[PDB]
């Protein structure tokens, strides 16, 4: 069993008030079964698109989740991952300072 790594980054330079795209890239996990939610203020975002599951030279799986968002001075964005290698869902919050 391999533990998922989560990296959350935006497509464009984040600018408060400006429609952007938030990427959640989950890598290094195994087996391939996984659950990925992207969150705004701790709530499930509905229209999250995902890439097809793929894997690397080391056989470990990866996938890209992404959704439309607007960075603001008050909203938190997060990527939460549920995977058999962890007893608890892991959440990583987007931080533009990165």
């Amino acid at each position: 069993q391999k533990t998922p790594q989560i990296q959350v980054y935006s497509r464009h330079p984040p600018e408060n008030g400006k429609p952007n795209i938030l990427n959640c890239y989950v890598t290094q996990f195994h087996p391939p079964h996984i659950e990925i939610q992207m969150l705004k203020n701790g709530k499930k975002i509905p229209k999250v698109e995902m890439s097809d599951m793929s894997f690397s030279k080391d056989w470990s799986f990866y996938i890209l989740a992404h959704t439309e968002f607007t960075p603001t001075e008050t909203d938190t964005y997060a990527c939460r991952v549920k995977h058999a290698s962890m007893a608890e869902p892991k959440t990583v919050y987007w931080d533009r300072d990165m």
């Binding site: 391999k2 990296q7 980054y9 935006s10 497509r11 464009h12 330079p13 984040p14 795209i21 990427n23 890239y25 195994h30 087996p31 391939p32 079964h33 698109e49 890439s51 097809d52 599951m53 793929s54 894997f55 056989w59 470990s60 799986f61 890209l64 992404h66 533009r96 300072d97 990165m98």
Partner: protein, 265 residues
Amino acid sequence: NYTFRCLQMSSFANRSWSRTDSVVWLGDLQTHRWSNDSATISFTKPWSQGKLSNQQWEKLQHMFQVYRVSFTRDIQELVKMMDYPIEIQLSAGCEMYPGSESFLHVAFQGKYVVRFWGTSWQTVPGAPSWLDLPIKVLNADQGTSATVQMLLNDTCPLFVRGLLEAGKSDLEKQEKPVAWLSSVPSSAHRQLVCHVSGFYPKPVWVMWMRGDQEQQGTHRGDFLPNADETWYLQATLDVEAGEEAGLACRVKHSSLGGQDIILYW
């Protein structure tokens, strides 16, 4: 210069549940997907057929359709004779050169165990010993061995050649990077971050600079994919408070026509 990879992922949960999904990549550009619940292979590019005729494509896909159903039945029967859940992955394809080398690697429970090599299947150093029997019996399957050899020796390089011609304009697209700056505290001392996003192709140059002096301490992170087939990358630099003043991030990329991005902190 180019790696073409077919990636098969097969999960076997119990006697009655399994699925197989595959994706195909030419460099960093997905060209196919084959969902378990799809009878047929899906093109993820306008040019994913390459130079193959419709007839050659149909034939080739039929062959894969037979292999998909066959493979499922073979593993399921194999476990019924000779411990769940089962994850099997296959990575086959070829590496092209300017004037190729083909591969078929198999992993089991995420451990590389078997390969095709020349004319037969081999178990790989420190694979499970029980794998030798089914692999020998499989080496007795002349028809499969012949098809596999053709696929790898002939079909792959030839098909990829067509792809390369057919996807010229996608493979050689230039998308310009956009860059921005941030910094981050430490337990002690700050860390400068240069965000570079939206560039294609992958190769890129990113350095923290003080005037014309390279800050060799520049640490390049992993290339993270965007959802539009462009790349994201940070280049970072530890600094002391005070030290930021005068530093700049410089990005060079083939898309920029020699006009480097320079961003001064």
